[PDB]
Structure 1
Amino acid sequence: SSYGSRIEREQHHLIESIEKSTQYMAKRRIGALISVARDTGMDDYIETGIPLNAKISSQLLINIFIPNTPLHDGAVIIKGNEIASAASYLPLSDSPFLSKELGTRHRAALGISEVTDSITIVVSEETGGISLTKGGELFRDVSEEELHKILLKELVTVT
């Protein structure tokens, strides 16, 4: 409908914001952890975070992860067309198959990918590498094209 196109516009704006914010943060080596809900699992984890219920924008994400406010200390949960919360808890994965150069950010992303079907994006504070988790799998140091391809497939309803 005009509902469908509208949702499609919102979803592309979402993808765009994540990509741009993560690109900027990758350059500046700003650690980031952004989980995008695709079900009703993230509800418990949203409540552990600081409530924002704000509109999705690249500037907001980037500012969230600046290491000088309590907002950076955790994950950003995106739900519907909103940044539901910042500084949320994500469960660490107990996988020994995870690389050892990777730390608690990636491990948190992995865990949430294991117990939900949400897409999670990580920006390494150390390497500036961008990674992604879904279904208990981690795609490491993904390229912009690769990132865009996945986000498009997983977060934009084709219709």
Structure 2
Amino acid sequence: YGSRIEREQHHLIESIEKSTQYMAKRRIGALISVARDTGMDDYIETGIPLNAKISSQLLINIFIPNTPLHDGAVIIKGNEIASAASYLPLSDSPFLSKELGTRHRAALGISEVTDSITIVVSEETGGISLTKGGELFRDVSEEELHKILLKELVT
């Protein structure tokens, strides 16, 4: 019961790590929000429902540019990719650097009103960023991404 969950959470982390590394190298923009205690059903409803098993391959295929599923956020809920091409609210923060794009503003926006963990791949730089509780972790290393995902997603 609780042991099966740990396997699922590590698979989720690995799937995020592999897919964002693939997308970062190719400068494919991506926006992946993982729901936690705060429901995100209201934003899942804005996307295209997938209700799919989590995998690095499916995450990569979702974000391929100019495809039906890429234009918005993936939302992960429990052990599923719930929706793709979903809306996330844009932060009104003037503290967010003007160098960062809409993906970053939307990740910051959802992090201000939920406890989700949101991962961004920049299509401009390939840098990977994370938002949590209204804060931005900009351009994190693979080691840093791993430690944060471990701390925040393995419970």
| TM-score bin, normalised by smaller chain | over 0.9
What is the TM-score with the length of structure 2 in the denominator?
Answer: 0.98
**1:69-123 CA distance string (max 9 Å, x none):** 2200000000000000000000000000001100110000000000000000000
Distance in 1 between residues matched to 2:2 and 2:149, nearest whole Å: 18
Alignment match, 2:87: 89
Structure 1 CA distance for aligned equivalents of residues 99 and 148 of structure 2? 24
How many equivalent pairs are there? 155
Runs ≥4 residues deviating over 3 A: none
8 Å Cα contact 2:19/2:59 also seen in 1:
yes
Matches of 2:36 and 2:131, distance apart in 1: 13
Describe the superposition over 1:29-82 as per-residue Cα deviations: whole angstroms up to 9, x where unpaired.
000000000024311000000000000000000000001322000000000000
Identical columns (%): 100
Is residue 32–residue 118 contact of structure 2 (8 Å, CA) maintained in 1? yes
Alpha-carbon distance between aligned partners in 1 of 2:39 and 2:79, rounded to the nearest angstrom: 16
Secondary structure of the corresponding residue to residue 71 of structure 1: coil
Contact 2:28–2:63 (8 Å) recurs in 1? yes
2:33–2:118 contact (8 Å) kept in structure 1: yes
Determine if contact 2:33/2:119 at 8 Å carries over to the other structure.
yes
CA distance in 1 between counterparts of 2:66 and 2:43 reads 22
Provide the residue aligned with 2:14 in structure 1: 16
Q: In structure 2, list runs of 5 or more residues that go unmatched.
A: none
The secondary structure found in structure 2 opposite 1:14 is helix
Q: TM-score, normalised by structure 1?
A: 0.95
Distance, in Å, in 2 between the alignment partners of 1:22 and 1:101 is: 20
The alignment yields a C-alpha RMSD, in angstroms, of 0.9
Report if the CA contact (8 A) 2:38-2:115 is conserved: no
Separation of aligned partners in 1, 2:127 and 2:57: 20
Partners of 2:41 and 2:55 in 1: CA distance = 21
Instruction: Report the secondary structure of 1:85's partner residue.
Output: strand
Retained in 1: the 8 A contact 2:38–2:116?
A: no
